[PDB]
Coordinates of C-alpha atoms and ligand atoms in Angstrom, one line a residue:
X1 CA 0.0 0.0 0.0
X2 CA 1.8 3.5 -1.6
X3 CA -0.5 5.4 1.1
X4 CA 1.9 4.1 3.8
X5 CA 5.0 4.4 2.6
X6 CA 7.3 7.2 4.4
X7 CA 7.6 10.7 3.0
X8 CA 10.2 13.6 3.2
X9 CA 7.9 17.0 3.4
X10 CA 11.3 19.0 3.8
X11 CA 12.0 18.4 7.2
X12 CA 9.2 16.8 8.5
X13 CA 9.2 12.7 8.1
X14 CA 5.6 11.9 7.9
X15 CA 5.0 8.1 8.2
X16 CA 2.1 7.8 5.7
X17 CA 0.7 9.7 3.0
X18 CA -3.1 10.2 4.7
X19 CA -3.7 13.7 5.4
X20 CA -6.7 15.6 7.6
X21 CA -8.1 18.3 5.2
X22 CA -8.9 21.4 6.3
X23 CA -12.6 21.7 7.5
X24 CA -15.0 24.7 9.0
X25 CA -16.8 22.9 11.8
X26 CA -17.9 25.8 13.8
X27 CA -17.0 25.0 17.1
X28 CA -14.9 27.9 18.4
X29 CA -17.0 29.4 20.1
X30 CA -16.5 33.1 20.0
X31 CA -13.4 32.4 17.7
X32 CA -11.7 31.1 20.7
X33 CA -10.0 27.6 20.0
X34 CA -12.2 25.6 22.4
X35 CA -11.1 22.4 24.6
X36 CA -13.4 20.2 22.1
X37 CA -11.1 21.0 19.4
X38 CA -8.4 19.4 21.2
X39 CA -10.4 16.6 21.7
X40 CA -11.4 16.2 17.9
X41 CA -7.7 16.8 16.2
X42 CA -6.4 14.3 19.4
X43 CA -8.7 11.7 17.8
X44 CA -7.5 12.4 14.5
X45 CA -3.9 12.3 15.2
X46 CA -1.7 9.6 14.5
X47 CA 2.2 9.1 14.5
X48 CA 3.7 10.6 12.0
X49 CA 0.8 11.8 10.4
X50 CA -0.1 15.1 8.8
X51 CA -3.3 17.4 10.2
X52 CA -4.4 21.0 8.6
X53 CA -6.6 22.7 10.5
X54 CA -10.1 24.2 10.2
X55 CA -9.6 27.7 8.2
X56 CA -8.6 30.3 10.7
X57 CA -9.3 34.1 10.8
X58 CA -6.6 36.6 10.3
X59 CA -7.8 39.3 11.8
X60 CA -11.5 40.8 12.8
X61 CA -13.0 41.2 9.4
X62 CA -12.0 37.6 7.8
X63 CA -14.9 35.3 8.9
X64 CA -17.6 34.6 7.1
X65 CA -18.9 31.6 9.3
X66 CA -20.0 31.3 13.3
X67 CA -17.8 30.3 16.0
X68 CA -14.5 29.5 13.4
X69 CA -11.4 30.3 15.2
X70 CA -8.9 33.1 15.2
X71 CA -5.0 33.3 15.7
X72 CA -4.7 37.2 15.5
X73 CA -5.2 37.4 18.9
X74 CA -3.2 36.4 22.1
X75 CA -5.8 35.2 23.8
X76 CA -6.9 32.8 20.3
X77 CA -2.6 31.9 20.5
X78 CA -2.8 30.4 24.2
X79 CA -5.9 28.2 23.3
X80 CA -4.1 26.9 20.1
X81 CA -1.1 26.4 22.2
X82 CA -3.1 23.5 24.0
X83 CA -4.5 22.0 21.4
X84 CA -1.1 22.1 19.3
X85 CA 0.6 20.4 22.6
X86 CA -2.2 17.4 22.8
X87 CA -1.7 16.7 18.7
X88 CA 2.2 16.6 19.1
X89 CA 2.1 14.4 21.7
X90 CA 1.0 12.1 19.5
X91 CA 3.6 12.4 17.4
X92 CA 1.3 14.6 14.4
X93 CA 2.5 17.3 12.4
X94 CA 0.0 20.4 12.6
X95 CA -0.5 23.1 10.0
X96 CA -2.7 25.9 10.7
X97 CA -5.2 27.1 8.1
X98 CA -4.8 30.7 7.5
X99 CA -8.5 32.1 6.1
X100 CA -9.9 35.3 5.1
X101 CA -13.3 35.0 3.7
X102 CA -13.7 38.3 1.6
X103 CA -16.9 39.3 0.3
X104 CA -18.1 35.5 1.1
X105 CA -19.4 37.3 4.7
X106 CA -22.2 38.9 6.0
X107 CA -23.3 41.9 8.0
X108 CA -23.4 40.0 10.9
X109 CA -19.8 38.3 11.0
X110 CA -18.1 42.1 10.7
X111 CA -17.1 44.5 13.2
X112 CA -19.6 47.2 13.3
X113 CA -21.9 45.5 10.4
X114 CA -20.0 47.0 7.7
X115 CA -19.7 45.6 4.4
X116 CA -17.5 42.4 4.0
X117 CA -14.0 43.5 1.7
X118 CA -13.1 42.0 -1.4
X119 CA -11.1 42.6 -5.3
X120 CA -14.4 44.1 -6.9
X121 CA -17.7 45.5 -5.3
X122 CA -19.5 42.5 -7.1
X123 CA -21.4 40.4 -4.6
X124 CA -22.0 36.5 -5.3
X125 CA -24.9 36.3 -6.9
X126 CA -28.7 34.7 -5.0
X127 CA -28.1 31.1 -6.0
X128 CA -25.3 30.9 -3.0
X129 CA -26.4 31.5 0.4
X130 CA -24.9 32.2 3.4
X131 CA -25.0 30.3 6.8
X132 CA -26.0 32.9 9.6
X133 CA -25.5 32.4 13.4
X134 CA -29.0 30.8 13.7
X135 CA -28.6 28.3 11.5
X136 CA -31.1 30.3 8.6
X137 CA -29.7 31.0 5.0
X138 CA -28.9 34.4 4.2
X139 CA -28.0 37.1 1.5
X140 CA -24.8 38.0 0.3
X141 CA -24.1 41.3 0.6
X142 CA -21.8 43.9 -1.9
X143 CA -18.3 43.5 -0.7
X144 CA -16.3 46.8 -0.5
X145 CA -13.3 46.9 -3.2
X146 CA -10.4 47.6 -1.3
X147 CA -7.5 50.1 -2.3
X148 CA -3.9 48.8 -2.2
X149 CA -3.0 50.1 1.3
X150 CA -5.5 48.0 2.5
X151 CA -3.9 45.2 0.0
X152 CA -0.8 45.6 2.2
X153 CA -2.6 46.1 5.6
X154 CA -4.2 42.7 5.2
X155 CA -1.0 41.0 3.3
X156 CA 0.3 42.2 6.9
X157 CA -2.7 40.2 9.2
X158 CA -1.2 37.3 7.2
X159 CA 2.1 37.6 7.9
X160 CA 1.2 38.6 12.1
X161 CA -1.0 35.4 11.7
X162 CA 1.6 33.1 10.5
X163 CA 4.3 34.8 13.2
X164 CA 1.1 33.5 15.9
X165 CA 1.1 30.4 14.5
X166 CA 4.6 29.4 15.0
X167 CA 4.3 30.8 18.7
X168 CA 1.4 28.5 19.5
X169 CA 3.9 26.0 18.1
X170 CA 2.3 25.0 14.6
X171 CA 4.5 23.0 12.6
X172 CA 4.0 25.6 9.6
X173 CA 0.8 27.2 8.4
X174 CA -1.1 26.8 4.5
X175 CA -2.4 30.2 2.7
X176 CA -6.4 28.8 2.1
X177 CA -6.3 30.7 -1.5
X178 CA -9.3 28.3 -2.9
X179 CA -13.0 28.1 -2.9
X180 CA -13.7 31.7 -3.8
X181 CA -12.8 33.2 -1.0
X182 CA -10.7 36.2 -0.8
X183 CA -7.2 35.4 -2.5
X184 CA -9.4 33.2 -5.2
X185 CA -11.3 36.6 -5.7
X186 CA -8.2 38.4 -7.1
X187 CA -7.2 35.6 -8.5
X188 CA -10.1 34.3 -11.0
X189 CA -10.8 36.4 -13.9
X190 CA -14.6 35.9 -13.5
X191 CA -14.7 37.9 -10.1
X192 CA -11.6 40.7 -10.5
X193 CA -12.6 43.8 -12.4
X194 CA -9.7 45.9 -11.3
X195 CA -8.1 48.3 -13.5
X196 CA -5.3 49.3 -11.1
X197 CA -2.0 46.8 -10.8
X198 CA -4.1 44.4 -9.1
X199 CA -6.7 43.5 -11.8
X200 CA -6.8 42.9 -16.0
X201 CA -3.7 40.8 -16.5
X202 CA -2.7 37.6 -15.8
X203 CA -0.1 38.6 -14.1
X204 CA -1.7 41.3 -12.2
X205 CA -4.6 39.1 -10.9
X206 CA -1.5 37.1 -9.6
X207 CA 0.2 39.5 -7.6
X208 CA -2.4 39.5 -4.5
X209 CA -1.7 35.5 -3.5
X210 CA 2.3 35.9 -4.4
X211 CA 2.6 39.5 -1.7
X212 CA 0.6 37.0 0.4
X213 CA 2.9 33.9 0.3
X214 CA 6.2 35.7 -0.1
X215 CA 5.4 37.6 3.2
X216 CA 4.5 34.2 5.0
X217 CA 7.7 32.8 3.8
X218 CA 9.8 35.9 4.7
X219 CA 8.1 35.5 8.0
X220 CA 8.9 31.6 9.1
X221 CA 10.3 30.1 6.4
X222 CA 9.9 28.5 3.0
X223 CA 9.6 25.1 4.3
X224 CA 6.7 25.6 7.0
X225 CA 4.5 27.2 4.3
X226 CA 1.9 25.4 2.2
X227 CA -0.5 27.0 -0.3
X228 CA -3.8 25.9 -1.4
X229 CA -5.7 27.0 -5.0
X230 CA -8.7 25.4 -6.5
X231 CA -8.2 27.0 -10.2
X232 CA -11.2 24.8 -11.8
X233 CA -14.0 24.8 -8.7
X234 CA -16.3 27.3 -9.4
X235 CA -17.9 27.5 -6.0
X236 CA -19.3 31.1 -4.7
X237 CA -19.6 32.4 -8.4
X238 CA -15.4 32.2 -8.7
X239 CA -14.9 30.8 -12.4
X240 CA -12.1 31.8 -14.4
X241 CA -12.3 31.9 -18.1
X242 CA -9.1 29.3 -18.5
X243 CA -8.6 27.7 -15.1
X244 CA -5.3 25.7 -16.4
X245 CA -3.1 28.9 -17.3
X246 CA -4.8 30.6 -13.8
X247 CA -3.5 27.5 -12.1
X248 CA -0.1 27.2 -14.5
X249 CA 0.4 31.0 -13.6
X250 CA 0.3 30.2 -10.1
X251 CA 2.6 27.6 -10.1
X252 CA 5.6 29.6 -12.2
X253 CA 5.0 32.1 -9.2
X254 CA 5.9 29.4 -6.6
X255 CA 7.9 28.1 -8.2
X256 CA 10.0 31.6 -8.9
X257 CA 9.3 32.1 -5.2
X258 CA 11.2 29.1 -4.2
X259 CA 14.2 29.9 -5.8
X260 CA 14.5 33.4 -4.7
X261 CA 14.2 32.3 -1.3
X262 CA 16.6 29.5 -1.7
X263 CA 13.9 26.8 0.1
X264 CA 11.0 24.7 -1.3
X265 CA 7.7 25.5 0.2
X266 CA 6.1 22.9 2.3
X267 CA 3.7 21.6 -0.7
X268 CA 1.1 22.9 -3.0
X269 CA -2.5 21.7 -1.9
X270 CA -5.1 21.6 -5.0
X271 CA -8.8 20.7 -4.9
X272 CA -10.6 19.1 -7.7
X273 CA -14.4 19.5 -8.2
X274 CA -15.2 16.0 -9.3
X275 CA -15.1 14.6 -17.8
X276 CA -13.6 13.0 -15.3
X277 CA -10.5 12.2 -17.2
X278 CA -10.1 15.8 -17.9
X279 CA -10.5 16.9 -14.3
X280 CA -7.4 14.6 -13.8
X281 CA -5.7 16.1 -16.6
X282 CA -5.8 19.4 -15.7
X283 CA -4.4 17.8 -12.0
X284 CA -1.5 15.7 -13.0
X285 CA -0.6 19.1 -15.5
X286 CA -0.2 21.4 -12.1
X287 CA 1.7 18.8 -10.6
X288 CA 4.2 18.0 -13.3
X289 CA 4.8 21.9 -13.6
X290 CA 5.6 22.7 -9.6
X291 CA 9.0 21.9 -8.3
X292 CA 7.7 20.3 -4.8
X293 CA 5.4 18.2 -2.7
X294 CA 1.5 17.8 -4.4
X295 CA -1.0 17.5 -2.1
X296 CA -4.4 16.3 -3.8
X297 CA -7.4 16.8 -2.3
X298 CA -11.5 16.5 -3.1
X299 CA -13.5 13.3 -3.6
X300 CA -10.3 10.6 -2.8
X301 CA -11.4 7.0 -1.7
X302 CA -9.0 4.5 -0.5
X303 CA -8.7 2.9 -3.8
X304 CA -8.7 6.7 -5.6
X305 CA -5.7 7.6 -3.1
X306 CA -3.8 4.6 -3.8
X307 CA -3.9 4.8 -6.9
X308 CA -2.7 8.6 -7.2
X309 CA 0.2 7.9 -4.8
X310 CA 1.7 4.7 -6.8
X311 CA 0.6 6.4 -10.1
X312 CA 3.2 9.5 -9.3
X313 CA -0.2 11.6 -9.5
X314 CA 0.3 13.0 -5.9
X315 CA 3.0 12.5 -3.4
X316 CA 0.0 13.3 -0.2
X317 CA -4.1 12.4 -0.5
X318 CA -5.9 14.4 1.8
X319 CA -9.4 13.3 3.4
X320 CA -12.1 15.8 4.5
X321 CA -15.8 14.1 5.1
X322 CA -14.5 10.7 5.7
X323 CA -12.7 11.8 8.0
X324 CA -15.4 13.6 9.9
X325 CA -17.0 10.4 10.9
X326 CA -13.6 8.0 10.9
X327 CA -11.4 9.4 13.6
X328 CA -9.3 6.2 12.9
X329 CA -9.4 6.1 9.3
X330 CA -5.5 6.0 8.7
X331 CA -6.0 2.7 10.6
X332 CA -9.3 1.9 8.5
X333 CA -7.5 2.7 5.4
X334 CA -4.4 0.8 6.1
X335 CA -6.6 -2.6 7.5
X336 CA -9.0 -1.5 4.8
X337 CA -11.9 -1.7 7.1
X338 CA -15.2 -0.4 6.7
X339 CA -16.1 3.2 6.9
X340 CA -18.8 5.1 9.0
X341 CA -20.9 7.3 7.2
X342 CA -21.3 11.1 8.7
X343 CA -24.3 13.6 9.3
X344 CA -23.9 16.7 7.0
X345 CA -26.9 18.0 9.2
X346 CA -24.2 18.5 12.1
X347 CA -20.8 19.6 10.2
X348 CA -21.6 23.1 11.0
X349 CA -23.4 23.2 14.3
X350 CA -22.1 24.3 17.9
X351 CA -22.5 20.9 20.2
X352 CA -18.7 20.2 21.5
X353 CA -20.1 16.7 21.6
X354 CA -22.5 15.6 18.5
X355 CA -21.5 15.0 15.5
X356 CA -18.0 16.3 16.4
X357 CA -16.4 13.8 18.5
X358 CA -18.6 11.2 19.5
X359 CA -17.8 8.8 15.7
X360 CA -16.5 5.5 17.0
X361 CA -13.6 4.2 16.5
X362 CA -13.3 1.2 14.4
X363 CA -15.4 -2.1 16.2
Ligands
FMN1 C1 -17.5 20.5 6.7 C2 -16.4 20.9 5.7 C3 -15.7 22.1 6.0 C4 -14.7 22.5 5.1 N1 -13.9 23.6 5.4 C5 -12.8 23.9 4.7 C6 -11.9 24.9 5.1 O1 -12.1 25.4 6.2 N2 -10.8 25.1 4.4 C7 -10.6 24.5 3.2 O2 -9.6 24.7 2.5 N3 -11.5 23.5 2.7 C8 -12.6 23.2 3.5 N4 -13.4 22.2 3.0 C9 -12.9 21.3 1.9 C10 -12.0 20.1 2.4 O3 -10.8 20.6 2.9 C11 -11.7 19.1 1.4 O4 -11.1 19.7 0.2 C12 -12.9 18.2 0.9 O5 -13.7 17.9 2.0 C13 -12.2 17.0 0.3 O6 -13.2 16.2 -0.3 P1 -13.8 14.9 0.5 O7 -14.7 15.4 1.6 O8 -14.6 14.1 -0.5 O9 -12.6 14.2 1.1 C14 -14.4 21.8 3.9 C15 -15.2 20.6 3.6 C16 -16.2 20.2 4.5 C17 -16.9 19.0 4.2
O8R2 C1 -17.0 23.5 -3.7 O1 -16.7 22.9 -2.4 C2 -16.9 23.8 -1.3 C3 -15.6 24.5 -1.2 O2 -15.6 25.4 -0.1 C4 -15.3 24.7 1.1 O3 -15.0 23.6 1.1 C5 -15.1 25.5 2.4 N1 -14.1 26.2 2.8 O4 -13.0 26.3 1.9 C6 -16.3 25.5 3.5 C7 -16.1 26.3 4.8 O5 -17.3 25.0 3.2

C-alpha cells in the first residue's frame, strides 16, 4: 500500500501519505479555539501523520462563518497552544489554516456590520447563500473593493497570523487561496474587475496570492508554508475563463518564489471539483509543472488515493468528510476496514459533543 509508505515534506518525516483536510466545523465558540477541538484533532492524530486545521481568521474582518477560530489574537494563540501540545504528543505534524473569507461574509460576522472586503464590489450572486448564526440562509451582501494600502494592511494580518502560529507551536501554516474566498477573488478572472495593478492581467490578478505567500515565507520560512488553490471549482460564483493557465500562472509564481528564497515551500495543496479524465488532466498538469510536494485533495477514496500515490499523481491524499465520521481512518484505510458514514446535518453546528467527536472508533 503507496498510502503508507514514508515521506520527506522537507523536514518533516511523515509516516504515511493520509492527510486531515482542512474543514470549517464551527466550534470555536466566539473564535476562541475551544477544549473540544483538542479533543477532535487528538482523535485524528496519528504518529507521523499530517493534520491542517479548520480555516482560521486573520484578523477581525476575515470570517464569514460562526464560531470558526482566530490566531490574530493572544488570547486565540494560548488556546491553540493547547491543542497544538495534545496533537504533538501524538507524534502529528500540525499546519494551521490561515482564512480570510472576503466578500463571502455577512453583516453580521463584521465589526460594526460594515460591508465584508473584497477585489471588486461585485457580490456572489442569489443562487449561494450564506450560513447565519441561527442556522437560517442568508444574503450576500456587496463587498467593498479595497485600495492597495488595504492590499498591504491585510497582506500584513497574514504575515502577524503566520508569526502567531509558530508561537502556539504549529508546525508551519497553509495560505487557504481556494473556494472563492478572498485570494481566489483576485485571482479568478470571473470575479476581479480591477483596472489598477491588481486586476486585468494575468499577471496582475496574480500578484495579491504571491505578496501573500512571499510575506509568510519571509516571516517563518519557505519550508513551513503550504499554499492551497482550487483554479477549476467554481464555488461562490469564482470561475475563471481558463482555469489551467490561472493554475499554471500560479505555479511559475511558486515556483520563482522558491528559488528566490533559496527553500522549497512545504507543498502545493489543489482541490478538484469531481469529464472526469479531464478533471485529472488538468491535475496531474499542475503537478508535473511545480518543483515540490503535491498534495491532492476533493472526492479521494481508498482505492482513488492509492492509486494517485503509486501512479506519481500526488506525493500526499488528503481526506475531509471521511474523515469527519472516521477518527481512525489512517487505521481503517491501512486494515481496509469499513467506513462510517457522517451527518452533513451536524458539520456546521455548535455541540462540543454531536457530530463532532462522538464517531467510533473502528469495532
Ligand atoms: C465540513 C467541511 C468544511 C470544510 N472547510 C474547509 C476549510 O475550512 N478550508 C478548506 O480549504 N477547505 C474546506 N473544506 C474542503 C475540504 O478541505 C476538502 O477539500 C474536501 O472535503 C475534500 O473532499 P472529501 O470530503 O470528498 O474528502 C471543507 C469541507 C467540509 C466537508
Ligand atoms: C465546492 O466545495 C466547497 C468548497 O468550499 C469549502 O469547502 C469551504 N471552505 O473552503 C467551506 C467552509 O465549506
Amino acid at each position: 500500500n503507496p498510502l503508507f509508505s514514508p515521506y520527506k515534506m522537507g523536514k518533516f518525516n511523515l509516516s504515511h501519505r493520509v492527510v486531515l483536510a482542512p474543514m470549517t466545523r464551527c466550534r470555536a465558540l466566539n473564535n476562541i479555539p475551544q477544549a473540544a477541538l483538542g479533543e477532535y484533532y487528538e482523535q485524528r492524530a496519528t504518529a507521523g501523520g499530517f493534520l491542517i486545521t479548520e480555516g482560521t481568521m486573520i484578523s477581525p474582518t476575515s470570517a464569514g462563518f460562526p464560531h470558526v477560530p482566530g490566531i490574530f489574537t493572544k488570547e486565540q494563540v494560548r488556546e491553540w497552544k493547547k491543542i497544538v501540545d495534545v496533537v504533538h504528543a501524538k507524534g502529528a505534524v500540525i499546519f494551521c489554516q490561515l482564512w480570510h473569507v472576503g466578500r463571502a461574509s455577512h453583516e453580521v460576522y463584521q465589526p460594526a456590520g460594515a460591508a465584508p472586503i473584497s477585489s471588486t464590489e461585485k457580490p456572489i450572486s442569489n443562487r449561494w447563500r450564506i450560513l447565519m448564526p441561527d442556522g437560517t440562509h442568508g444574503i450576500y451582501p456587496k463587498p467593498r473593493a479595497i485600495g492597495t494600502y488595504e492590499i498591504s494592511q491585510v497582506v500584513e494580518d497574514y504575515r502577524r497570523s503566520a508569526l502567531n502560529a509558530i508561537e502556539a507551536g504549529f508546525d508551519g501554516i497553509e495560505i487557504h487561496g481556494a473556494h472563492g474566498y478572498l485570494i481566489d477573488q483576485f485571482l479568478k478572472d470571473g470575479i476581479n474587475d480591477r483596472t489598477d495593478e491588481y486586476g486585468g492581467s494575468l499577471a496582475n490578478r496574480c500578484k495579491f496570492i504571491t505578496q501573500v505567500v512571499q510575506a509568510v515565507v519571509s516571516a517563518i520560512g519557505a519550508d513551513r508554508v503550504g499554499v492551497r488553490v482550487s483554479p477549476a471549482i467554481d464555488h461562490l460564483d469564482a470561475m475563471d475563463s481558463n482555469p489551467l493557465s490561472l493554475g499554471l500562472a500560479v505555479v511559475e509564481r511558486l515556483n520563482k518564489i522558491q528559488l528566490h528564497s533559496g527553500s522549497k515551500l512545504a507543498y502545493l495543496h489543489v482541490t478538484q471539483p469531481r469529464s472526469e479524465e479531464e478533471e485529472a488532466r488538468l491535475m496531474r498538469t499542475l503537478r508535473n509543472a511545480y518543483q515540490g510536494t503535491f498534495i491532492c485533495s476533493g472526492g479521494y477514496t481508498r482505492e482513488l488515493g492509492i492509486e494517485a500515490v503509486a501512479q506519481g499523481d500526488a506525493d500526499l491524499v488528503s481526506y475531509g468528510r471521511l474523515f469527519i465520521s472516521n477518527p481512525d481512518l489512517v487505521m481503517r484505510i491501512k486494515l481496509n476496514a469499513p467506513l462510517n458514514k457522517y451527518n452533513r446535518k451536524t458539520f456546521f453546528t455548535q455541540d462540543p459533543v454531536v457530530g463532532y467527536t462522538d464517531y467510533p472508533f473502528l469495532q
